[PDB]
Amino acid sequence: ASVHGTTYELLRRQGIDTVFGNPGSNELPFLKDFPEDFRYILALQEACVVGIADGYAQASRKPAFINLHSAAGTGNAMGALSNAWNSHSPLIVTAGQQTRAMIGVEALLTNVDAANLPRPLVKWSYEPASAAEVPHAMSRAIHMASMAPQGPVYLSVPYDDWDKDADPQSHHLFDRHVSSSVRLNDQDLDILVKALNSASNPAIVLGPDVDAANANADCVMLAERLKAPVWVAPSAPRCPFPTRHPCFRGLMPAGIAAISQLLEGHDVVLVIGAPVFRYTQGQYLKPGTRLISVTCDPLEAARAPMGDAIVADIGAMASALANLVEESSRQLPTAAPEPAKVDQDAGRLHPETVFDTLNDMAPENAIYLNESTSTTAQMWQRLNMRNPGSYYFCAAGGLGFALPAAIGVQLAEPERQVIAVIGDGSANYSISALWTAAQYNIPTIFVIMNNGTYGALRWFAGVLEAENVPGLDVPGIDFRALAKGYGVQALKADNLEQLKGSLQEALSAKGPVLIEVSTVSP
Amino acid sequence: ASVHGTTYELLRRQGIDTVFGNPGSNELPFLKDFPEDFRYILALQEACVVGIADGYAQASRKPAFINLHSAAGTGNAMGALSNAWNSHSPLIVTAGQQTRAMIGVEALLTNVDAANLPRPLVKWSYEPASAAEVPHAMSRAIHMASMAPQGPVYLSVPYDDWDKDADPQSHHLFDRHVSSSVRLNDQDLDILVKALNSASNPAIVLGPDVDAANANADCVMLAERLKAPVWVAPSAPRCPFPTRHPCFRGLMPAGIAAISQLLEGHDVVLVIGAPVFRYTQGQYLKPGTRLISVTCDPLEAARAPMGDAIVADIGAMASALANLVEESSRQLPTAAPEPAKVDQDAGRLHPETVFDTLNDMAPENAIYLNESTSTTAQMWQRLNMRNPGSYYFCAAGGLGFALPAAIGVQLAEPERQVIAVIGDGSANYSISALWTAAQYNIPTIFVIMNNGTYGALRWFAGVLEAENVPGLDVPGIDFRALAKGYGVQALKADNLEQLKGSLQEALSAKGPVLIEVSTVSP
Amino acid sequence: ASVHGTTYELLRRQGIDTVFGNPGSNELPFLKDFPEDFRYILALQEACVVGIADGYAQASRKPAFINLHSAAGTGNAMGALSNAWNSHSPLIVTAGQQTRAMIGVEALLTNVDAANLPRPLVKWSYEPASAAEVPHAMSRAIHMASMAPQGPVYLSVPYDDWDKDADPQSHHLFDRHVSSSVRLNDQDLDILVKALNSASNPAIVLGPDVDAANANADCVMLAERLKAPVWVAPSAPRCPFPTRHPCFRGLMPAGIAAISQLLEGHDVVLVIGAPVFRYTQGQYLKPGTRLISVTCDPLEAARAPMGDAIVADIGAMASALANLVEESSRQLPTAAPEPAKVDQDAGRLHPETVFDTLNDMAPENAIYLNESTSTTAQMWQRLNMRNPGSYYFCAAGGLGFALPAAIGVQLAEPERQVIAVIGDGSANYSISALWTAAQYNIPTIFVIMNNGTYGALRWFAGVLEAENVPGLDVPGIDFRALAKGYGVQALKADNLEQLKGSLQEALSAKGPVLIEVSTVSP
Numbered sequence A, B, C: 001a002s003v004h005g006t007t008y009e010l011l012r013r014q015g016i017d018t019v020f021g022n023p024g025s026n027e028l029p030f031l032k033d034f035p036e037d038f039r040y041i042l043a044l045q046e047a048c049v050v051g052i053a054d055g056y057a058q059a060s061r062k063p064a065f066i067n068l069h070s071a072a073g074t075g076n077a078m079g080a081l082s083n084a085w086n087s088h089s090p091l092i093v094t095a096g097q098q099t100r101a102m103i104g105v106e107a108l109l110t111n112v113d114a115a116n117l118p119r120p121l122v123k124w125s126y127e128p129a130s131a132a133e134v135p136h137a138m139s140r141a142i143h144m145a146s147m148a149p150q151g152p153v154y155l156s157v158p159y160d161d162w163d164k165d166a167d168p169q170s171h172h173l174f175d176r177h178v179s180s181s182v183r184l185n186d187q188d189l190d191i192l193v194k195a196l197n198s199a200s201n202p203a204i205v206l207g208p209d210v211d212a213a214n215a216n217a218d219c220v221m222l223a224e225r226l227k228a229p230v231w232v233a234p235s236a237p238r239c240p241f242p243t244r245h246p247c248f249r250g251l252m253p254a255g256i257a258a259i260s261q262l263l264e265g266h267d268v269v270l271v272i273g274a275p276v277f278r279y280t281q282g283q284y285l286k287p288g289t290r291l292i293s294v295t296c297d298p299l300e301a302a303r304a305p306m307g308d309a310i311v312a313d314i315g316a317m318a319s320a321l322a323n324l325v326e327e328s329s330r331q332l333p334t335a336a337p338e339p340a341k342v343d344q345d346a347g348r349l350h351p352e353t354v355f356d357t358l359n360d361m362a363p364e365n366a367i368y369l370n371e372s373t374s375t376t377a378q379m380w381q382r383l384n385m386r387n388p389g390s391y392y393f394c395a396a397g398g399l400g401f402a403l404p405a406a407i408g409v410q411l412a413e414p415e416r417q418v419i420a421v422i423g424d425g426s427a428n429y430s431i432s433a434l435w436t437a438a439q440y441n442i443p444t445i446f447v448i449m450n451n452g453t454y455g456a457l458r459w460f461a462g463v464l465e466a467e468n469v470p471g472l473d474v475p476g477i478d479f480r481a482l483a484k485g486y487g488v489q490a491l492k493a494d495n496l497e498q499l500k501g502s503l504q505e506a507l508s509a510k511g512p513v514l515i516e517v518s519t520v521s522p
């Protein structure tokens, strides 16, 4: 067998059948004779390629496979890898290298010091020392991406390796199953469970790794048994809990002081599947509050400024806890009141109005993506997200995620309507991703919130009283024309009447639709 | 509180009371006002400093703390860190940096690009962005070193940080407890246990992480219940099993083909706490053999060329398995026959004779270190090692480990006699370590096997029929004089009579003793 | 031709005939069939191997070739590479890697992420992607080490590459000549020369790159024509000027303020072949002082906090300047007065007495090395060093340089008596280097200054008024016994009478000699 043949067999045997890519000459010997059972998803730029794969991986809860071209293609994707690093997305990033004989002289298209290029944003980065090693190296990549804590990995492969003979002993790689489905030992788990049972006023904080693990339902049970309020850790990349459940208390403020005050009065705070904490912009905890973190990531456990930590699989830990804890006789928290309806005239739309309307009209199993940076708090308060996998927001804050990721999520969840709510500033970073939705008829709905400015930046500047900051406005962009350019149906909504009409049309459409919404300026 | 004060409090609260070091000006603001409850172990070279700390950490099964001087001191230790990386030794390596104001201009003693220096041989490498961050960074270092898979870590700290005010919120770091004591979920563990119960001819292979976890006794029980033969994974850095137990089958050959043949006929092979495999110098497995690996290290799981893998804590997994598996009705393996006594005249000593004599004379709870590279196989067959923590051998093959490490082990185990058996070639790499044993009266016994050559290299050259290789001989070294130079009592053994007499004296001595033994030349 | 054959031909064609090394299995296919015209210098530890090569390279003013074993051997040398980085020493460091087929599984002796190991202390670090590339990669290494600014480089080569067929087109590598012998363009050089001619009170500061370039004589002429005082840049790794020349003003203090005061009153300060500046422990310049730096290193030019800079070859620039500048009518500086003779009784020796005696007795073309850290200022004032290449001191401050480097210098300069003056603390770092001097009969003289303490550290602690610092004393070392251990003749000097007698004997000896001198304690 050839290295090409053996590698594609390893991929399929390991559950991979889709390649997200933008092609180049170094990759042609890999892409040629493309297997009939494989499917190739083309995107026009590497940030888009990885963003689509990322959404696909996160929604599917399985590794996604990416193929990029050398240094320039890999480099074009590194902003996307920054998000993937912080969302623990299992991405197998492969890039083609020059033929081995051409690397030394540094011929055009040579990826110099390839493995160092993607660092520090990868779990593992490698270029094999010989063609026959490629399947073993690919096996390593697959498992490194997939083991907890999941994350992106990088494999650089010389052009000429693919046609070479593979080692027959490579067949041992095909069916390797590696498990990181582990939880705290019985003795220590019993101690933890007793600590929870003994809490007088426990609180639960949940992060993106709960949703990644599909531990949402186990967390609901856990919160019901402990009769404990539940918050989502700040800077949330996913939604780990039903947002209308009686126990749900919403998205935490990202401030250090704000969080300590929020947790004050709670004797035991159980954090699950979140960093402690993804702060932004001053006590860590107030006296009386004990914090215990369950995390799949040693790096998270190491850097928490407070609390005990357990490094384990979130799915295994959530299931164990939900089933071991006693049913508290305490009264179950009462549901948070519905958010107020904001005054809206017949002019430009307040973001609050857009989210209310989306909540009114979207299916109950819709999936939302957020890259409307100044409206996040309102979005969380106004969308009823009952199901797991219902929310994605760039984990590292890297704009250009939501647009391509929404396409990947929709590809992964063909039966759930994806609605990406993206600001006019953010829409540009990965605008070319629209083409992929059009070409493959992936029916994502893109809601562009157009207020003509980088709103979140103006706000921040405003709080700091920072004057004379350049570059905060982005006037003069026609999103209907951009959508048309890439073959996506386009609508505009200058008022509520038009918003409702556009959504009605979009929600009945057979392909992707972009709606440009005129929103109020800050 | 000062950063100095807060950092030493973090250390002691985290169980650290000993600093292994070689001092420099960048480190003086850290070392000054040295706490009365702390103890400072000086070594004359950085390879020795880290080697001593490594032995200390491995024997104590807890992190060791190291303080080195800038780039030159850190660099002098990186060969030692290569061993530590492969033995999963929890070493907290700190190095002093220039004052922040002097880094830019690159004043003398500046550690340029400090964090990159120790990579890739560390789990974590860091230089804090400000003085107040130092305790948090130290907290990160402590936990990164200690979490499974354990390993060395590096922290670079500017001179001037120590006297600065610490953040009062740093007190939250003091009592943080982080656990990686996890094992496979109940459901999947039950499946594994059924697979073991169902095996017709199971075999067990154990690596250094068993001994690190003190899982030895649980592994004995596991092997007795399964009635299974037990081997030690190749290139063994530690001894994970009693070498005279009926089930014990010895050290595996490091060859790929050799191991597949050894495992042939065994339907299920359970590997615990070892890489799969640390080969040297050709099927991975023969048909009929299924391999399952339990490892604390994702990197090990990823790179195994065959078998399933479970990434979990070795102590937790060994205990769970030993207690869950059924008692097989199969007949317990019978003990391997004692090794033959080799012909010995009244002249130079055959290594076989030295090990027999050591086994005859040493206490039953002796601890051995090996850096006699051409005699390893004989050592394993001839020393009865009943207890855990009884054997150490450089995990990466880096010579200069055993001599200092034997001092650290003896410091950690004051009641167990340490006997380091070290070749004449290997003895030189970290010769200056002798001084530390002398100065602190650490009563290690050093047995120098002197055959005047790099024997293992001559052998290897011989197998390859490689001719005209320079640099394989090391004549003209007087180890009694070197020992005298560093203040260690010294004896010579030119024959068996003298070997017995020297050992009798050494085993009754009140301080360190070096015995130079004249061994047969290859 | 084989890769082995082609590589050794490339080496010899490029002027390399000596390999400094400590061998291992990964290196045997390289070392076997060792060419008859090549010579192999064995050292017992890697810090010693590189230190010897470093001294050899610096004295010979040509690249030295090193061969080390994998990660552990490379790591053992990185402290030595820190010195080499700061002295711009052209060292070609090669290390053997596992066979290509064994790298992936990570067999014993695998150098993981090899190229990253030596960074950031190398100009260039590489592992070839195939056997046939090895000669081209070696060509790259040779030229990278040799081009200005010279420095160490690293090449990692898999075991199995050596026996493979070489590309016949590799013959084009053999006679490649690369030049960096460049200087400022005529127009700008004329401007510089006019600036020097126009100076009313010019000063010259010279660094190690002058001595490396053998630009010493041109600098003398330059200083005579400009009638300008000449200082040596602080933390001096070499001596760039005759120390008794009328213009010579000695070693600069390393303080920022100290240097600005020293240069005050000088309208133009010309720095040649030095970083600006290698400070330690506050105006950079005082008003009225203009600084112009000529440096072979862009990194030096970039990081100078003041002055203009020209990045050019020091030899070419010094020659051009010396020949272009006008002969100033100013009166030539008068020679600095001889240093005072310090009171000396019949007891322990004051360092001042040792240096006076050395100056009295040593040949006028002696070469000195310094690693007696508390006596540097006295050494500079008391040794008359008339010739180039007469002084070496660890460029990065990394102790363990002088002892092995003195052996390499003596090997490079067989007709010039090398005298290494090394403190009792420093002597231990690379003590095993003594063996190489003994084995190859390299007649270096080692003067051990024994005061029982890390004197420079006690002094520094004293200035900072830092109390309770551990680890500053090193009692109980017998240097005569250590020398005996490694086969070097040994003498002791407890007083002046014995010092003179020992030196007389050493200076008449036919082999290496170590003299242990009892010096006054701080």
Ligand SMILES: Cc1ncc(Cn2c(C)c(CCOP(=O)(O)OP(=O)(O)O)sc2=O)c(N)n1
Pocket (backbone or CB within 6 Å): A079, A371, A372, A373, A374, A375, A397, A398, A399, A400, A422, A423, A424, A425, A426, A427, A429, A451, A453, A454, A455, A456, A457
């Ligand atoms: C790749 C990238 N570039 C720049 C930014 C900085 N940035 C920028 C440019 C923001 C404004 C986004 O504007 P928008 O129109 O998408 O949304 P709002 O008007 O609601 O803020 S939010 C923010 O963090 C970023 N986060 N990521």
Ligand SMILES: Cc1ncc(Cn2c(C)c(CCOP(=O)(O)OP(=O)(O)O)sc2=O)c(N)n1
Pocket (backbone or CB within 6 Å): B079, B371, B372, B373, B374, B375, B397, B398, B399, B400, B422, B423, B424, B425, B426, B427, B429, B451, B453, B454, B455, B456, B457, C022, C023, C024, C025, C069, C072, C073, C076
């Ligand atoms: C730091 C380092 N340098 C070089 C080697 C290479 N090497 C060397 C030099 C060996 C010979 C050790 O000789 P010895 O006298 O200690 O023992 P034997 O004579 O029994 O082999 S074994 C081996 O792998 C190494 N492993 N580690």
Ligand SMILES: Cc1ncc(Cn2c(C)c(CCOP(=O)(O)OP(=O)(O)O)sc2=O)c(N)n1
Pocket (backbone or CB within 6 Å): B022, B023, B024, B025, B069, B072, B073, B076, C079, C371, C372, C373, C374, C375, C397, C398, C399, C400, C422, C423, C424, C425, C426, C427, C429, C451, C453, C454, C455, C456, C457
């Ligand atoms: C490799 C390394 N380790 C530690 C130091 C720190 N250090 C040490 C340990 C010094 C004392 C050297 O003592 P000595 O006996 O050689 O000389 P003095 O007594 O004259 O200082 S000078 C100094 O910078 C260093 N520079 N390099």
Ligand SMILES: [Ca+2]
Pocket (backbone or CB within 6 Å): A423, A424, A425, A449, A450, A451, A452, A453, A454, A455
């Ligand atoms: Ca906007």
Ligand SMILES: [Ca+2]
Pocket (backbone or CB within 6 Å): B423, B424, B425, B449, B450, B451, B452, B453, B454, B455
């Ligand atoms: Ca030997």
Ligand SMILES: [Ca+2]
Pocket (backbone or CB within 6 Å): C423, C424, C425, C449, C450, C451, C452, C453, C454, C455
């Ligand atoms: Ca001293």
